[PDB]
Amino acid sequence: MEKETGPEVDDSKVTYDTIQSKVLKAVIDQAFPRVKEYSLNGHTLPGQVQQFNQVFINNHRITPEVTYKKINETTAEYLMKLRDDAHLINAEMTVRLQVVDNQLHFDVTKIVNHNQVTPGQKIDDESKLLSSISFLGNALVSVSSDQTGAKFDGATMSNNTHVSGDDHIDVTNPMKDLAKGYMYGFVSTDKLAAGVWSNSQNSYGGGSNDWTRLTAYKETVGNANYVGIHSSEWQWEKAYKGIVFPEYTKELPSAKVVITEDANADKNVDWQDGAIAYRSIMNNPQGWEKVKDITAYRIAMNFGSQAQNPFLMTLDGIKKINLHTDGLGQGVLLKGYGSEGHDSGHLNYADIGKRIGGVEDFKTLIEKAKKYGAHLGIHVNASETYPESKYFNEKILRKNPDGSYSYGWNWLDQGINIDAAYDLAHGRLARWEDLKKKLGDGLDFIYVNVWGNGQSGDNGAWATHVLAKEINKQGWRFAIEWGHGGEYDSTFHHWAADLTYGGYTNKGINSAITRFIRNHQKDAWVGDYRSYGGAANYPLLGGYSMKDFEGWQGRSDYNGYVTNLFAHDVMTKYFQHFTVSKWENGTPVTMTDNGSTYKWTPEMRVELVDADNNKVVVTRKSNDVNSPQYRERTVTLNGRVIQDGSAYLTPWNWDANGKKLSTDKEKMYYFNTQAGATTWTLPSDWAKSKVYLYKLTDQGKTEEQELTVKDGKITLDLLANQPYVLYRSKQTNPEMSWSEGMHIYDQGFNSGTLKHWTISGDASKAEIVKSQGANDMLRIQGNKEKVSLTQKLTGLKPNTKYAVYVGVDNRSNAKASITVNTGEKEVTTYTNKSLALNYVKAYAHNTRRNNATVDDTSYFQNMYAFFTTGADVSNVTLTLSREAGDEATYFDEIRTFENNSSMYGDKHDTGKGTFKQDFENVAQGIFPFVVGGVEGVEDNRTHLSEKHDPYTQRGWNGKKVDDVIEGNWSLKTNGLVSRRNLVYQTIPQNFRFEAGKTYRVTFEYEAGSDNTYAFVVGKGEFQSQASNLEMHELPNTWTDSKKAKKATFLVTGAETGDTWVGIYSTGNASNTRGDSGGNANFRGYNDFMMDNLQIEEITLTGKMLT
């Protein structure tokens, strides 16, 4: 390339003015809100040196008619009239330029559209809206190739660990052309650096073209090249299908420049100085301050009516983590907080799940969690819905150009995507307000799943900012699924924080510039995941690594959850208590992974600081990518080593909510991923103190040991992958009030003792033991006489109907029982040997080997008693018992909760009399059935279907069968045809067919096809050597009937007491009658629904005999 030239500047017809603070002067044009040049401490940066007196309004070029007024020494104002008759533009906007110390503020302070526009109302011609305002072509700041050290540095969105989103461009003549959007952008000389912020929600496209609030341009002026940073275009009045959006969707355009000398004392002026200064002018995502102290994120899952994780139970999980981390902060995402659980009832945000304890228990969870620094969030969806949801309506549904439904997710039911723009234009905001009204204060975050993938149409920067603003207005923090989503407002990105998702192209934001700026404000980054290479091969700042133990994707590994907190998250969060001040890259390395060999330039040293002038230095131990030292760092705090390679001894001076700890509560955490002794220098305020070490377990601080301090040092030679904590004085563990609000003490056997139970019989026969997943359970075995354990049920309401269950896995033939005595009445339920394996994937005691009870299996199933309190609730007792037997019974999870079922002779209490299940008052699950093994351990595709006429019922969109047969609820199975396996079955603890007695079993059913499902009678444990079943294939219920059919069967209990009945998915092909895809799923060809179950003990007489 040859040296470039462009027109010189003739300013003979220009009148300039100046506005200035004490430190910064800006020369501004009186004709147009343009800054020619900035001066600070005798140094200069150009602005827009060549006049460009045009703006673009709705993408039309306009020469504004401008009048000017200098308001005061720092502030000028411009009235800009905008007229273009041919394009129906008739408007005016007012702009102010204001110097605030070393900042320049550009604000559109008033906009008037002379066309008639009413937010929320019809507009007959959308071209009458004032929809976009662009000042592209007027740089807010620039640098010239004639200036020493002229450079531009900008960040774009990249989620590929191999590809940095950052550009670093020397501003030279000649240079390559530049006309490109950026999220962040800095220009600098060797004397001054500038950064630019804008609230513009412009996009130039997806990927690296998105979130492009700035635009950088090269312009050649005389003999110099300038690179200028412009705000990208701003949005204003918008509509969807002629309906103007609500007023709150309009945000007045704003941009700021900040200009700085050296800001990190390294005696160089570059983009890093700009980035430090940029923190004073940037938007900050709402709730960001909380992020640095949320050390323990995880998901607690409910799904398919099962109530795997009742709100009050999650509080016990929080207490376990509080003990095990010694008071680190927590963030629990409640996936399935609403309706029947995860992916039920979407859009009705206020519908808090009733079977997990409803709004009352959710409020209690939020309140009691505060003292543990545990913040709750919920999973919501703003992109698709199901017929059951109150908000399912034809008008909200997304249609394709050909008129067909845009079908969404199919799992429990077939959903349909919604049109998010229609939704915004028709009262979406009110749904968040309804949830806020019902739930009240204290919820931390809303996690909006799926948004950003286009299912509901436009989910880009503007639409996401609007959505985030609705959520933030209720006082909630915004969180999102995708690494690329919600760049402006999000504080958490699930695909950044769960390192296992999506592979190397779909992770967090791969930008040193962006991470420098915002590391402390969000978990949005690239964490350590060696097999992705590039930025993920041991990032020096770490990066959030999320695991779970409460059922999400079948995750149950508590111990691995805790070790991962300490292996990745403690130091990640430590760094978030400081701001990045310096970032030094090393030499490029060559890596090979994921099918390519590529160059990567790694960070080698990162420095951070806080408001107390503490200094943290993180250094990679080697730039050699093939050395073990590439994946090691040292960390110093004011020069003192706190991490070196596999071990750290890190101070922690913040309580679980982030508040500064008192001196006597200051501590240090030790963790080493390897065996071996390590030696550490103590800080001066520890060097002469006594020091005590504790091993951290689910019981809190254990194995107290005073350490020997020699020459101000300590040496630690402890277990690998085991957290420890150090203090300068002896510490104890607090009372945890286990299971508070649940009417019993320590329902999950987490307190390490049984002393709060009254034990009758030989107490040595009852012990707390760990499952194969380390889940503590009550075990009774080897007893020659009855052993019972009793507690009072406390805090009950008088004259109230209740259910109680205990999870039970009985490996003995001996009777294992749950008994409630109300003071006035006693009810009891028992099981002999358990015969049904547990297939509920989100449930902690399913039969997956790694959370098996014993012998690699789990037969845990909920064993219920139903009772009613009288006038006096001071002596209501719950007893677990086990008659004599050699083998073990395991019990875990005692849940007592209001319930209004009437299953026993039309009465509530466990008792004699005809059994009936109308499904209208189910405590949880699909009682008296339990899900079978048809899908193995799964988020089972059988659940309680909820009525919403007409959408859930025959005829809507050609639906062949009703989701709900009678009342508001039925038992629905979605699409589980041709599986040759058991869909669900009774178990004797839920309904016992007594030996030698005969029962009439009746129910109503829908079936979409002939002989796809069968009513079956079995006994003992089902094996798919296959078990004998009595098989009754069921015809479809709609080709020759306008409603569900009634079925009736006689069943005599086998002498072994283990008879059961159920529904089996046959080997027959279903018939979708020429329909396919979403239509076929929605219409119910492959479905089965049951309702109005009745089981009556009878004596065979007369014609019953035939």
Ligand SMILES: CC(=O)N[C@H]1[C@@H](OC[C@H](N)C(=O)O)O[C@H](CO)[C@H](O)[C@@H]1O[C@@H]1O[C@H](CO)[C@H](O)[C@H](O)[C@H]1O
């Ligand atoms: C990872 C995740 O959140 N997936 C949910 C997402 O799935 C679509 C893509 N595969 C993706 O974004 O990852 O959105 C759908 C709803 O449209 C589901 O919520 C996905 O989660 C899945 O939910 C089902 C139950 O519906 C099961 O629990 C799966 O285990 C779970 O991954």
Ligand SMILES: [Ca+2]
């Ligand atoms: Ca510097």
Ligand SMILES: [Ca+2]
């Ligand atoms: Ca337990």
Ligand SMILES: [Ca+2]
């Ligand atoms: Ca019903």
Ligand SMILES: [Mn+2]
């Ligand atoms: Mn449903």
